[PDB]
Amino acid sequence: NTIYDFIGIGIGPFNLGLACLSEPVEGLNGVFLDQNPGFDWHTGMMLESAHLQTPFMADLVTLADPTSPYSLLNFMKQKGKLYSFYIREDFFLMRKEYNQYCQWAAERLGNLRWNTRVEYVSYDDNLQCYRVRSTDTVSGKQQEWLAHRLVLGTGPSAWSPACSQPYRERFVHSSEYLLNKEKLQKKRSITVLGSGQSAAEIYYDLLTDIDRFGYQLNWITRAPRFYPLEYTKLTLEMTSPEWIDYFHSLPAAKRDELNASQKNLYKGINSSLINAIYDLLYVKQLDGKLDVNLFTHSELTDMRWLAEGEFELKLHQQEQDRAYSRRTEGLVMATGYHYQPPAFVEGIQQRIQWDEKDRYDVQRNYSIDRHNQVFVQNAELHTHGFVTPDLGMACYRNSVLLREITGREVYPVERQIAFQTFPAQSE
Amino acid sequence: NTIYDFIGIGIGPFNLGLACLSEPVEGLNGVFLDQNPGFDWHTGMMLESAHLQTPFMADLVTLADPTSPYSLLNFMKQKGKLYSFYIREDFFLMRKEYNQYCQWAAERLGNLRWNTRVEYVSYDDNLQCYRVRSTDTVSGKQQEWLAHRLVLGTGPSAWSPACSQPYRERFVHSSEYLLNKEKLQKKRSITVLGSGQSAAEIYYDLLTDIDRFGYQLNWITRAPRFYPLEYTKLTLEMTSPEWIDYFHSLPAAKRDELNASQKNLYKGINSSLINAIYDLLYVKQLDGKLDVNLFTHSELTDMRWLAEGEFELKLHQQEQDRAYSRRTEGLVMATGYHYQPPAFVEGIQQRIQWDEKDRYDVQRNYSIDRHNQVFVQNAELHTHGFVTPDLGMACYRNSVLLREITGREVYPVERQIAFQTFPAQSEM
Amino acid sequence: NTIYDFIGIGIGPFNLGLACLSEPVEGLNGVFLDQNPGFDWHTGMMLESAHLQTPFMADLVTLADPTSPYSLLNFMKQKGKLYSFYIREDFFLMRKEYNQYCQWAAERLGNLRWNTRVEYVSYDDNLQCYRVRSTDTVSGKQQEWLAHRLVLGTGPSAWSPACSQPYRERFVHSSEYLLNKEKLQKKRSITVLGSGQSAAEIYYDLLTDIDRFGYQLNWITRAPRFYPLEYTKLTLEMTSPEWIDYFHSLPAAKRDELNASQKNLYKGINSSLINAIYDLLYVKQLDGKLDVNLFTHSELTDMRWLAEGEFELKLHQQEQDRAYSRRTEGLVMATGYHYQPPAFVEGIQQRIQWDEKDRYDVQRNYSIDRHNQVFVQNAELHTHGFVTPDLGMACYRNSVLLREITGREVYPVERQIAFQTFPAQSE
Amino acid sequence: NTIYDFIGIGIGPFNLGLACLSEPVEGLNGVFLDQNPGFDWHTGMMLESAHLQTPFMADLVTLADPTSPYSLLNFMKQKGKLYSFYIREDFFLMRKEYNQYCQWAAERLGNLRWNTRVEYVSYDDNLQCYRVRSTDTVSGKQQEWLAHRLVLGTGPSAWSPACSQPYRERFVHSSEYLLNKEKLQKKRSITVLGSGQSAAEIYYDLLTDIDRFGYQLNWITRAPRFYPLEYTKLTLEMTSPEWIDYFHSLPAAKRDELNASQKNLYKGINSSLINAIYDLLYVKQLDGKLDVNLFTHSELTDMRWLAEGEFELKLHQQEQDRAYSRRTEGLVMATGYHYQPPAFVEGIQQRIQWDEKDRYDVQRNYSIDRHNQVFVQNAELHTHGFVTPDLGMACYRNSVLLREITGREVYPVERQIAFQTFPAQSEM
């Protein structure tokens, strides 16, 4: 019967944000569909010690509306622990607590529909809207949802280098780490492959028990250094509306060349952790020479499993321009995630703007179609820059989505916060 | 004419808090009276570098209700700078910003009445309520306000030692520092007298320009050391409902001895600042021997002004048990504040419970009468302990006041926040 | 045959300091006797994470003589790791590294005699000097050493409350913790009793594994709070020659009343650790209500072992003035150490100045006799104040010992470093 | 008359280091020549608040020999303040203190010859050694020094963009900042041009008094961001012998591309300072909109002085690829320093190995001749990488110089300090 103003497909932290922000808006009928039974965010990398890299004000709502009851501070109050959080005096939430908070919010909301796997989406020429075919996971029932606008907040999927595909059975991706940790620690050697925060957290986790179990503990990365995530406040001003307006110079190549070489700004390791790793190598080394190796500049060219019972990683050191091999029993592939458009998007291919490399040619308002109806959350890294996976700019993006969806500026979008001037400007 | 559910007398940060918390409550008609023309908090000490000692969640409302539009985060949002505050990533507001924030809140509110000096309060036996006689400061106009309940957020007054009263004209209390700074810095010698955060902030401020002007810069304190404010997280659990219950059940004599021995918990200097002062003495000393003196254990016994154009401070070093004199032109008296019950309370003396030392015998719900009608904000240090001047426990206190005023629990009041157990407690 | 200028009895870090400082002094013939086979300092509290509470410049020599080859910096250089230490950029040595450093120094020195248990000391009226009777631990051989002066750097011994003596067999002192940890963690409940750094380190160690094993983890202390060690720089000026001169007001009672109530200055917990404990309680509590109890103001009045298989601690909460009981299976008594004069001192009792409570009536130059010949290192807390167990004032004390022993001021003693004036002073 | 084992020309912190390290070596007769009257290091940038970017163990000697009496810790001891330094508990010396320390060392040494400008150097074929012709700055007297080996610690010179040369009289280089500060602060507008630590320190210094004087305070940089100096400990392992060996084996073209892409490793701003600048902009902005501008990606293409009494900076924003102009009265050119071989090196051109770009083809032992006799301190950035201006690798370099000069290894030279492996390396 009744057409929705928008349907959100996927309830990651971004669409969960949109949901908290959209619920109290007058005359906005929106619904969110997810296939899982509840919210559960990236639980394979929930080590006890792990925090977010982002202060708590980058919760679901506060940067758009601090008065929202879905705030992290309000959560803390309802759980009856806000004074403890006050005494803690720490800007950075534990991942476990953020996950608990997101679950509390998802439970409180009314506009979420869990256990709803979207199977196909199509544009109905006769009704002039989008038709979303779902399947209820608990009952099997088929249902169709009508909507003027879609907002695609699907997650990305685990990614390993192309040459590793034949050994998926042996190595463990970061996402499978916690489950296979006990099995890894029984091995003679472990190698973490990858540059980011996940790799570092894992490396630190294993380094903790290097004296307790046998293992050699290696870390190989393509990155030129173990670079920290750049957190100096003048650079943080680049994660801003003003910079994003600037960044829409509109020259795509520049954008793509900028995104390689701005990796300090989004793909870095938390500075504290790099230093904690050095300090732990130092402390462990007091009992004897440690059996560790750490390489940089190193691309994985090929790999192979030997009868011996070991991997042989062929590596290319790009700076030196010289190839070399390394061996390991255990292999943790902390190579992160890649977004690729979900199966259901096949049904609206001709309605989507694609760029030269067959990804979404995303517009400034986060839209993927030719009429401001199909929007995307995350997966605009190539055209909106390093700011896209940031929870800190979730409220910004959600606020402009709500502006497009509803016509009005529902949440005011702060477009002059920064001391710098980014574009050229004469006097 | 119309009887109020409660009247707040005084609009400091505590009653301004109560005001933000009470405004949206259904079936609560409250009003707040203050004699000043607007909110303007401790502007003599409002130095550019000065922060609050307390994270921003101890704003007017957040610890009772983070969704309130009077929150510091909402203020930051409406001013259009929340992202800058996010980048700053600092828990501690500048005093200048807190003051700007409190002013914004006071402006937004409807329940505040400025320029209204309360002159007398009395209990009307026939109407069975309190009668508050005010005077408009600008026009002189008399008005009477009727109310079932009062909440006294009058605040404490600046205090200097008894022997200093004859020289009020020459020395400067910390509260008047910024107005007299330029006049102090022209002098040959300045002496900060007192141990607290204000003393230290002033000492640091003056030490910054010791190179630039002539002055000798002295610091004398009665305190045994320049003790820091204890800010380790296990001690912060003592600023909790459970500790306050514990403290309030301890005999009257015990509580007073606790308040004199627990000055590191509330009357201390922020440890960063103590260290910044040492580091600045170190850096300044690289150009020559500094002209500074710092004494401890030293009680001011007497003072006097000489024809020469100098004070002579007579001091007694209590540990050594030996007297000595010191000289100074400028004198900053950073000796803090003392509460004494305001003039208007004379009219309800018979209705107030007094303890053995003629102060309010305050009950656990912050009430001073025999019927839960006259409440106090920040005059219960002697019965509720070191947590009383804390902005961090303003929402707690306001939340229990609102529970008494309106019989329901309007904002949830934690009974238990802490991992420690303070009172004795047997197992099984 | 030949009389020594001084003999040091005991080679703790204090006499080991004196030894490094005395070795290069011209015309000073001194020797140091210890019963153990080498240096090994307080190895029961060497947890991996534990640091000293004192910057590395408070090593054996640097505050008296930074050019000494026994410096921590020189140690780091000879081991070939000084650049690593530079990158670490941490003032506070790991206890394990300090111990390794002290061992390196002890090995390099020539004036140390290990495996030499002093059995008796006496004053020879005819030779007019001290006669020290030793026993070689490896060979059994008796030997006598002659000396004009003695410097007693014996360690203190483990101490538990008087009421605990009948249960020495069941509870574990902090010094026995590492050995009994595995046995403690199998129990249903553990209780750390005591206020200091040791108690806190242990509490943190056990709290780490509270989710992994069953246990209830309690902490009871007589202290009014879990007070931190006061490290603010204006208070650190009280650990200074100028303050020590002041502190010799000469009124003993004041000194004794000062030493209770100056416990923040020497008996505190490192601030970082208190906060790390709060932060870890916070993180653990995310999985469920934690089974922990923490009491303060609580004196242990009596204890008893029940047939049930549990201790019953009777406690008195001194502030509230109310008694209460608590139960626990495991009991870690982190009640620290007490010095008492060693057996051999019996032979020179009449030559030693004793005060009203039968401890050494120590003079300003650290001497215990009536002629500036018998000196003591540590064990002058009652008359020199909170500064005495500090490694930071080891060089100061050693420098004044060398001044008394040799007559000359061998190492200059810095007597005007402090911005404050401590005594009364008119103008 | 007497032939020296080596002569050091220039007494910067590097050759002053070599001097302290060489003095106690048996059978080493060395002497050091400098044209100035004493040691006085970068006094235009010696602001009260300014620290070194490098822990105190990177003093003149400690990383080669902590027992040396020229150590910073020994200095502190002789001055009678080591306990104060212990209480300070800060790894980073104030520049003023480092300067005082270097002066104390220079005074204690015997092997330094001040007021001695080297004018020409030549190789004597018959004596088989180097002949160094000096001129006494005070008296004009000529002297010739003979030596088997030279070590050139001349240092780099202040550098401004090519288009600025006609206005040297009006703008101020960072090196002349403290002398011209009072004159800058009288102006209506000031513009700091440049990205580095000096620029930032100056910008912070001026921002402090933006309230007090009129000025507009601008900051323009060619750099893409105000990048911090990378100080995370895994990256600090790149300042190591193993990394330097790795760097020096990379083809000439590769090394030059590395030195332009690795400016965060040596030409960055201290992260505390970047954040202190943001925090100070934040605090100042509480009184009104600040009159500041900050541009990035901006190359200075041209400049010109107008009759009005102002510069007009023409800038090109390289990322956007768009030109724009800006105006300023005061101009601080914080564009750093460049090495170019001093005049005297003309006389030994034929004896020096030159690379494809006419700079010294420096060998791994820091030598520039074909026989391990002419060495350089801090002119090998193009062949030994980003670690060259680091005081932290001064003792390393001095230790290998001493090994070449005297054939024995006088101070032990680490081959391997780091947990990482930088070059490719196969297993078995």
Ligand SMILES: Cc1cc2nc3c(=O)[nH]c(=O)nc-3n(C[C@H](O)[C@H](O)[C@H](O)COP(=O)(O)OP(=O)(O)OC[C@H]3O[C@@H](n4cnc5c(N)ncnc54)[C@H](O)[C@@H]3O)c2cc1C
């Ligand atoms: C310089 C300074 C800094 C401080 N900083 C902090 C901090 O960072 N964090 C923290 O937790 N605590 C701090 N404190 C402690 C505490 O927060 C303050 O003392 C606070 O102002 C006290 O609260 P109040 O409501 O009593 O305030 P007050 O400012 O005393 O408010 C009282 C108001 O009532 C009015 N009044 C009095 N009598 C009458 C009458 N008869 N009729 C009408 N109006 C009347 C007064 O004019 C005034 O406006 C600080 C104190 C000082 C002095």
Ligand SMILES: Cc1cc2nc3c(=O)[nH]c(=O)nc-3n(C[C@H](O)[C@H](O)[C@H](O)COP(=O)(O)OP(=O)(O)OC[C@H]3O[C@@H](n4cnc5c(N)ncnc54)[C@H](O)[C@@H]3O)c2cc1C
């Ligand atoms: C403001 C500033 C701060 C810095 N701070 C740090 C820091 O904290 N940490 C760090 O690691 N690095 C720092 N650096 C980088 C580096 O340490 C300095 O550039 C250093 O001064 C360079 O070493 P030098 O030996 O070349 O010194 P210089 O000071 O350049 O010494 C050269 C000397 O040789 C003399 N000379 C030149 N030609 C002749 C001649 N023909 N005859 C006689 N004498 C001659 C000069 O007069 C001068 O006295 C800083 C640089 C600057 C500009």
